[PDB]
Amino acid sequence: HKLLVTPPKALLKPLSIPNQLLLGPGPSNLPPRIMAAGGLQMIGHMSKEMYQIMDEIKEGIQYVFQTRNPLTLVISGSGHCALEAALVNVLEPGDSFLVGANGIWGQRAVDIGERIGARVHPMTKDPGGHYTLQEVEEGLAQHKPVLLFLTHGESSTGVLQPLDGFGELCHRYKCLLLVDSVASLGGTPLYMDRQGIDILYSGSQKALNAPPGTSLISFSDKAKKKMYSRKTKPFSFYLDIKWLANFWGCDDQPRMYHHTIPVISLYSLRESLALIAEQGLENSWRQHREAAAYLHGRLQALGLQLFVKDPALRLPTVTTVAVPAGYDWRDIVSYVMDHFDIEIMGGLGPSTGKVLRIGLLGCNATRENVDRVTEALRAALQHCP
Amino acid sequence: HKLLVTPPKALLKPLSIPNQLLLGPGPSNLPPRIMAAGGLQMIGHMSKEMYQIMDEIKEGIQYVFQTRNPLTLVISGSGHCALEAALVNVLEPGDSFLVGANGIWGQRAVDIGERIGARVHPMTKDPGGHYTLQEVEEGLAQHKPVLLFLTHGESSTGVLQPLDGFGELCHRYKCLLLVDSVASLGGTPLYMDRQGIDILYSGSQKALNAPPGTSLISFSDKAKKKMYSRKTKPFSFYLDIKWLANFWGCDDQPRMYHHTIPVISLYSLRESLALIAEQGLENSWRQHREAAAYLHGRLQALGLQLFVKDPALRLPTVTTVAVPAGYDWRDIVSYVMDHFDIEIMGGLGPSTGKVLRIGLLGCNATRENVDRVTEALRAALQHCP
Ligand SMILES: *Cc1c(COP(=O)(O)O)cnc(C)c1O
Ligand SMILES: *Cc1c(COP(=O)(O)O)cnc(C)c1O
């Protein structure tokens, strides 16, 4: 009858949070509109009003993806969860799957691919390598895979991958194209339909400035074919597209309960799509281009060296800087946080220990924050060791 | 170069939401403290401050679960996603899995079990059936399963399942116990450790009144054994416990990035655990008992008949009422919403069409809302057909 665990003393103090300027690869600081909807009251997860908001979010994804794919919806999970949803519904165990292992994203896409039992083919490329359209038409012709995965914005390495024709290509091989646009969406040009991409996904907490935990996905009719006619059943119920599609209104059938959508995160995601819709994709693209170029200038002035040699290959949203020799990078990062309240990051996966990563995302890709991060990284450079 | 999709006109209007009194099985209305943290700014998903909040959330789960299991953490997904996480790490394909199919929850637990390739054994019981400790010791002895699943609070049917000894039992069969306490946690007594439960999970949007999209989970050392020594790799990367455990600080090794936790939802979940810690589990349990009894009284007065005959079996958090003959239930539900701005629900799964469901959850389990829902359901009863 007696209680083993007593109420935690930490929980009896008020929730307090530090004020940080988040200039790493994400998540990023939230604009006022997005904090506001986050503080909103609940409505029924199946009210007609919730359905209306969901439908608006749908159009929002279609606008930012540039597509009319009826099979377009939010995944109730982080970026990873959309990637996993893409793979777990598309790949039968047995299917052949070709992955551009450019950075950690291609690796994760492999790890998942393996886990769901697939003939995965690692086109390994060193941290910084953007796959050649020449390397691709060889790789896929060679392995005749049902699916290719490619990272658009490689936030692990800072690479901006060209996408043109790969869609036209893959289609000729009866191959569907899967693109990770989590870091790239909103920050650089992308056209799901015109570039004939089959599965595009992005995440909430990058250029869109919504809080992390939701993600975005769209399937071309070809993918819709393959998924609705697979013999095997996806190893996941949570991520089962047939269920998700229906509840999200992509069917002929009335919405059936599947799982409880994250209502409040949807309010905030909605707003983030409203915001970029008001700005406009091209205006937003330009801002990210302009901010990144500015940031590049200042870093080079500091004596710092950009990690990606060719500028046309540089991801505007996440800039990667080689590590200043004679410096323990961790100090640099710590000094920025410790003295300026600013978050920047280091390497991830392949790029671990080899780079610093600086993000410029949505309402935060500004000349000012470029100034703040430069003036912070200058000071770091002065007294780090 | 030209843009197919134009910015959606719906997104160019401000986000507006109706004011609803949510008295169904969840999600429920949010208290002020929980709306406030929801409107908070972002911090680094890997800042020491985020780690501190996560650790406080951990204690919070340990307190509300009544456990010291080191393997205790939040799942970045709805209730379903915790259930799926439990199953996908515990069950090897081949393993024998025994499920109390009392309501839709047992069914979902089957569907998943099948999907991950398991020897699932459906102890079907009609909508309302609480498994007999007698039916259990037979079923599990018979099938020698590695895992049993049982719904604690059956929100599909309104049944409150007894749990005592099943833990002691299952252990004697070298069987791990898995309990769904999503609807029951905070609202009725439950003691993970004292009742020797092996895997307990709950969800954020029921009695805790946090927004939907996160969930809670804990593994006993026995489960921790089985999971860290399975030969096969879980069909999911997102839900892989080895990765999740590490990032959540349950390891000897420093936290490695896995996926981006939903920072803002964590703020809100934290607060919801702070709130129940201040109230206290027994005080909260009593409130739900008192409110439910009150609600029961009023429903019976209306001529309405409680769906679960024996009162000791009634889930305090979700009350189920048989459908008044001569009434199309959908009208009743609609009339409540249309005239009173109140949400109540109907059947789900097995109980579809056969019942109405009324939820009493956390700060919302109050005599007042019992009054409001009674006075709304009286009026409905007057002029429904
Ligand atoms: C941030 C990011 C993701 C999202 O990962 P989560 O942590 O799961 O949200 C996915 N892909 C890329 C390329 C990213 O930069
Ligand atoms: C509400 C509830 C859940 C949660 O389901 P999600 O919609 O995935 O959050 C799980 N189990 C039971 C018994 C519930 O009442």
Residue B367 Cα, gap to closest chain A Cα (Å): 21
How far is the C-alpha of B243 from the C-alpha of B77, rounded, in Å?
Answer: 15
Identify the nearest ligand to the CA of A179 by its number: 1
Nearest CA to B26 out of B172, B289, B213 is that of B213
One domain for residues B186 and B323:
no
| Sign of the Cα pseudo-torsion (A144, A149, A151, A156, in order) | negative
How far is the C-alpha of B335 from the C-alpha of B385, rounded, in Å?
Answer: 11
CA A200 to chain centre: 10
Terminal Cα distance for chain A, rounded: 58
- Beta-bridge partner residues of A96: A119
One domain for residues B159 and B235:
yes
Question: H/E element holding B320?
Answer: strand B318-322
DSSP letter string, B52-115? HHHHHHHHHHHHHHT---SEEEEESS-HHHHHHHHHHHHPPTT-EEEE--SSHHHHHHHHHHHH
One domain for residues A266 and A121:
yes
How far is the C-alpha of A29 from the C-alpha of B159, rounded, in Å?
Answer: 44
Annotated binding site of B for substrate: 357
CB-CB contact of B272 with B204 (8 Å): yes
DSSP letter string, B180-243? E-TTTTTTS---TTTTT-SEEEEESSSTT-PPBTBEEEEE-HHHHHHHTT-SS--S-STT-HHH
One domain for residues B18 and B123:
no
CB-CB contact of A34 with A268 (8 Å): yes
Three-class SS state of B179? strand
Q: Choose one of B279, B307, B334: the last residue of a domain.
A: B279
How far is the C-alpha of A206 from the C-alpha of A108, rounded, in Å?
Answer: 18
Phi-psi region of B22 (alpha: psi -120 to 50; beta: other; left: phi over 0): beta
A326 burial via Cβ count (<10 Å: 0-12, 13-18, 19+): exposed
**Residue of chain A whose Cα is closest to the Cα of B29:** A42
Token pair of A16, please?
């307090």
How far is the C-alpha of A175 from the C-alpha of A154, rounded, in Å?
Answer: 22
Judged by CB atoms closer than 8 Å, whether chains meet at A265 and B267 is answered as no
CA diameter of chain B: 71
Nearest CA to A377 out of A300, A313, A307, A314 is that of A300
Phi-psi region of A163 (alpha: psi -120 to 50; beta: other; left: phi over 0): alpha
Nearest CA to A9 out of B59, B270, B272 is that of B59
CB-CB contact of A206 with A380 (8 Å): no
Judged by CB atoms closer than 8 Å, whether chains meet at A17 and B267 is answered as yes
Nearest CA to A255 out of A47, A98, A84, A33 is that of A47
CB-CB contact of B316 with B370 (8 Å): no
Q: Could you tell me which residues come within 8 angstroms of residue B187 by beta carbon, excluding any fewer than 6 positions away?
A: B153, B206, B207, B284, B285, B288, B315, B316, B317, B360, B361, B362, B365
Query: What is the total count of domains within chain B?
Result: 2
| Sign of the Cα pseudo-torsion (A352, A85, A136, A193, in order) | negative
Query: Is residue B374 lining ligand 2, measured as CB closer than 6 Å?
Result: no
How far is the C-alpha of B43 from the C-alpha of B191, rounded, in Å?
Answer: 34
Token pair of A81, please?
């969860």
Peptide bond into A316 cis (omega under 30): no
- The enclosing domain of B77 has a CATH number of 3.40.640.10
One domain for residues B121 and B251:
yes
DSSP character at residue B145:
-
Q: How far apart are the CA of A80 and the centre of ligand 1, in A?
A: 6
Nearest CA to A248 out of A211, A214, A197 is that of A214
How far is the C-alpha of B320 from the C-alpha of B183, rounded, in Å?
Answer: 13
Q: Please count the other Cβ atoms lying within 10 Å of the Cβ belonging to residue B104.
A: 22
Phi-psi region of B26 (alpha: psi -120 to 50; beta: other; left: phi over 0): left
Query: What radius of gyration do chain B's Cα atoms show?
Result: 21
In the block, tokens 């929100």 appear at: B155
A44 burial via Cβ count (<10 Å: 0-12, 13-18, 19+): buried
One domain for residues A23 and A50:
no
- The enclosing domain of B286 has a CATH number of 3.90.1150.10
Pick the atom of ligand 2 nearest to B155's CA: 15
Q: Could you tell me which residues come within 8 angstroms of residue B215 by beta carbon, excluding any fewer than 6 positions away?
A: B74, B75, B77, B78, B79, B81, B82, B182, B201, B202, B203, B204
Q: Choose one of B263, B279, B295: the last residue of a domain.
A: B279
Q: Choose which residue among B130, B182, B190, B319 to substitute to test ligand 2 binding: the one with the highest number of ligand atoms within 8 A of its C-beta.
A: B182
Token pair of A342, please?
């600013």
Amino acid (one-letter) located at B205: Q
From B35, B39, B238, residue closest to A77, measured CB to CB: B238
From A42, A55, A56, residue closest to B211, measured CB to CB: A42
Query: Is residue B80 lining ligand 2, measured as CB closer than 6 Å?
Result: yes
Map chain A to HEC letters: CCCCCCCCHHHHCCCCCCCCEECCCCCCCCCHHHHHHHCCCCCCCCCHHHHHHHHHHHHHHHHHHCCCCCEEEEECCCHHHHHHHHHHHHCCCCCEEEECCCCHHHHHHHHHHHHCCCEEEECCCCCCCCCCHHHHHHHHHHHCCCEEEEECEECCCCEECCCCCHHHHHHHCCCEEEEECCCCCCCCCCCCCCCCCCEEEEECCCCCCCCECEEEEEECHHHHHHHCCCCCCCCCCCCCHHHHHHHCCCCCCCCCCCCCCCHHHHHHHHHHHHHHHHHCHHHHHHHHHHHHHHHHHHHHHCCCCECCCCHHHECCCEEEEECCCCCCHHHHHHHHHHHHCEECEECCHHHCCCEEEEECCHHHCCHHHHHHHHHHHHHHHHHCC
Q: How far apart are the CA of B202 and the centre of ligand 2, in A?
A: 8
Nearest CA to B190 out of B84, B57, B280, B285 is that of B285
Question: H/E element holding B51?
Answer: helix B48-65
What φ, ψ does residue B121 adopt, rounded to 5°? -125, 95
CB-CB contact of A185 with A202 (8 Å): yes
One domain for residues B51 and B11:
no
Residue of the nearest CA to atom 2 in ligand 2? B182
Judged by CB atoms closer than 8 Å, whether chains meet at A68 and B4 is answered as yes
Q: Could you tell me which residues come within 8 angstroms of residue A101 by beta carbon, excluding any fewer than 6 positions away?
A: A107, A110, A122, A123, A124, A125
Q: Are strands A176-180 and B119-122 parallel, antiparallel or unpaired?
A: unpaired
Q: Could you tell me which residues come within 8 angstroms of residue B382 by beta carbon, excluding any fewer than 6 positions away?
A: none
- Beta-bridge partner residues of A156: none
**Residue of chain A whose Cα is closest to the Cα of B55:** A10
A297 burial via Cβ count (<10 Å: 0-12, 13-18, 19+): exposed
Q: How many angstroms separate the Cα of B171 from the Cα of each of A49, A161, B96, B181, B364?
A: 48, 54, 15, 20, 37
Nearest CA to A104 out of A155, A147, A152 is that of A155
Question: H/E element holding B148?
Answer: strand B147-151
CB-CB contact of B287 with A236 (8 Å): no
The angle that helices A48-65 and A263-279 make with each other, rounded to 10 degrees, is: 40
Peptide bond into B27 cis (omega under 30): yes
One domain for residues B267 and B284:
no
Judged by CB atoms closer than 8 Å, whether chains meet at A212 and B282 is answered as no
Q: Cα-Cα-Cα-Cα dihedral of A266, B317, B319, B102, to 10°?
A: 90
The experimental method, as deposited, was X-ray
Q: Choose which residue among A22, A74, A76, A80 to substitute to test ligand 1 binding: the one with the highest number of ligand atoms within 8 A of its C-beta.
A: A80
Identify the nearest ligand to the CA of B82 by its number: 2
Q: Choose one of B279, B300, B331: the last residue of a domain.
A: B279
Phi-psi region of B163 (alpha: psi -120 to 50; beta: other; left: phi over 0): alpha
Sort out which chain A residues have CB atoms less than 8 A from B59's CB and list them. 8, 10-11
Amino acid (one-letter) located at A169: L
B383 burial via Cβ count (<10 Å: 0-12, 13-18, 19+): exposed
Residue of the nearest CA to atom 4 in ligand 1? A79
One domain for residues A194 and A241:
yes
How far is the C-alpha of A38 from the C-alpha of B55, rounded, in Å?
Answer: 23
How far is the C-alpha of A203 from the C-alpha of B260, rounded, in Å?
Answer: 10
How far is the C-alpha of A259 from the C-alpha of B191, rounded, in Å?
Answer: 26
One domain for residues B3 and B150:
no
Judged by CB atoms closer than 8 Å, whether chains meet at A27 and B260 is answered as yes
Query: What radius of gyration do chain A's Cα atoms show?
Result: 21
Structural domain boundaries, residue B334:
1-30+280-385
Q: How many angstroms separate the Cα of A68 from the Cα of each of A60, A221, A245?
A: 11, 10, 15
CB-CB contact of A291 with A368 (8 Å): no
What's the angle, vertex CA B308, arms to CA B306 and CA B312, rounded to 5? 110
Q: Could you tell me which residues come within 8 angstroms of residue B300 by beta carbon, excluding any fewer than 6 positions away?
A: B306
Q: Could you tell me which residues come within 8 angstroms of residue B112 by beta carbon, excluding any fewer than 6 positions away?
A: A237, B83, B84, B87, B88
Identify the nearest ligand to the CA of A259 by its number: 2
How far is the C-alpha of B239 from the C-alpha of A81, rounded, in Å?
Answer: 9
For chain B, give the number of residues: 385
Nearest CA to B18 out of A57, A38, A41 is that of A41
Q: How many angstroms separate the Cα of B104 from the Cα of each of A200, A258, B82, B129, B352?
A: 33, 11, 16, 12, 10
One domain for residues B158 and B285:
no
From B27, B56, B115, residue closest to A263, measured CB to CB: B27
**Residue of chain A whose Cα is closest to the Cα of B83:** A238
Question: H/E element holding B139?
Answer: helix B133-143
Q: How many angstroms separate the Cα of B315 from the Cα of each of B194, B287, B310, B341?
A: 21, 13, 11, 25
CA B254 to chain centre: 31
Residue A228 Cα, gap to closest chain B Cα (Å): 16
Q: Could you tell me which residues come within 8 angstroms of residue B279 by beta carbon, excluding any fewer than 6 positions away?
A: none
B256 burial via Cβ count (<10 Å: 0-12, 13-18, 19+): exposed
How far is the C-alpha of A361 from the C-alpha of A26, rounded, in Å?
Answer: 8
Amino acid (one-letter) located at B74: V
How far is the C-alpha of A99 from the C-alpha of A101, rounded, in Å?
Answer: 6
Query: Is residue B349 lining ligand 2, measured as CB closer than 6 Å?
Result: no
One domain for residues B205 and B351:
no
